[PDB]
DNA sequence: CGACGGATCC
DNA sequence: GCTGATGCGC
DNA sequence: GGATCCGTCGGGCGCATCAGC
C-alpha cells in the first residue's frame, strides 16, 4: 500500500537533458477541478503540453481561467455531439502544432470527444479518454471494436512519425496495476478481453509502457482511486493513465512520473520527460 | 468497485 | 427564470 | 476456524435534467 514516486530524472541515458514535459490528467469535470485548484498545480508543473480528460464542459462554458494560462495558450478542445457532461478531452500547448486533428477516422467512434491528435516535427502526440466496458459489461463489445480501431489508427500514425499515446486508457494491463486484482478480474478495467487489448496495441503499433520500461517490477503505483469510501488513503487504486511511446523514443525517455499527491479528481496527474 | 459475506476446500 | 430533487454514467 | 474464491450490493463524485415553484 506504500507508494512515494521516485525523484524526477531530467536526463537521458545518453546524457541529453530533457527538452519536453507532457502532463496528462483526468479532471472529473474541468469546472470542478479548476475550483479545487488544479490549474495552480499545472502552473507549478510547468508542462510544455497539458492533456486533460473527462472535461465535461463545452467551449462556450469553458472557464475563463484557461485564457490566463500563459505558457499553455494554444488550446484545443473536443466534446460529445449528443451528450453534455460526458467525456470531453483537452490539449493545451506552448507551441502551436503543425496539425490538430480530432478523432480516429471511424465516424462511429468520433462522436464522444475522446481523441485529440497533435503533430509536431519530431513526434505526433495523441491524448485519449478510452471508453468503458460498463457496469454489467454492457458496452464491452463496443470497447473491443473501439480497440481494434484505435490500434489500427495509431499504427498508421506511427508509420509516418514517432508516436506518444497518453491519457486514460481505461485498462489496468497487469496485476501490478491494481491493488485488488482478483475481485475485479470480471469487472470494468480488468477484463481479460481488454487486458489482451492492451497487449495487442503494444505489439501492433508498436508501443511501450513508459512507466513499466523504467520501473518494471514496481508495484502499488496507481493513477485513480474510487471516491467510494477512502481508497486513496489506503492506496486502493488502479493505473489507467499511461504514456505509451514509439520504440524510437525509448532512447529519449528520461522519466514517466505518477504525481500521486496532486488532488482535485479521482485521478492523479502523470508527467513525462523527453530529450527530443 | 471495495466492502462483505457465503460457500466451499483443507 | 430560478432552484432543489433525481437520473446517469461511473 | 480459517484460507480462499467468487458473487452481490449500494453509494462518493460532477453535471445537468427538469419538478415545482
Ligand atoms: Mg471517470
Residue numbers in the entry: 43 to 318
Pull text from the paper.
The APE1N174Q mutant had a kobs of 2.9 ± 0.3 s−1, corresponding to a 290-fold reduction in kobs compared to APE1WT. We crystallized the APE1N174Q mutant bound to a 21-mer dsDNA oligo containing a centrally located AP site analog, THF. In these crystals, the backbone has been cleaved by APE1 resulting in a product complex that diffracted to 2.25 Å resolution in the P43 space group. The crystal form of the APE1N174Q mutant product complex contains two nearly identical APE1N174Q:DNA complexes (RMSD = 0.452 of 2329 atoms). The AP site is positioned in the APE1N174Q mutant active site with clear density for the cleaved DNA backbone and a bound Mg2+ ion. As in both the APE1N174A and APE1N174D mutant product complexes, residue N212 failed to undergo the rotameric shift observed in the APE1WT product complex structure and remains in the substrate conformation. We did observe one additional change not present in either the APE1N174A or APE1N174D mutant product complexes at residue D308, which adopts a different rotameric confirmation than in APE1WT. In the APE1N174Q mutant, the 3′ hydroxyl terminus shifts 2.6 Å away from the mutant active site. Comparing APE1WT to the APE1N174Q mutant indicates that this shift in the 3′ hydroxyl terminus arises to allow the mutant active site to accommodate the extra side chain length of N174Q and prevent a clash between N174Q and the sugar moiety of the 3′ terminus. We suggest that this difference likely results from a subtle displacement of the DNA within the APE1N174Q mutant active site to accommodate the added side chain length of N174Q as observed in our product complex.
AP sites are then processed by apurinic/apyrimidinic endonuclease 1 (APE1), which cleaves the phosphodiester DNA backbone at the 5′ end of the AP site using its endonuclease activity. Upon binding an AP site, APE1 flips the AP site out of the DNA double helix and into an extrahelical position within the compact APE1 active site. In the human APE1 substrate complex, N174 is within hydrogen bonding distance of N212 and the AP site bridging oxygen (O5) and deoxyribose sugar oxygen (O4). To assess the role of N174 during APE1 catalysis, we rationally designed four mutations of N174: N174A, N174D, N174Q, and N174K.
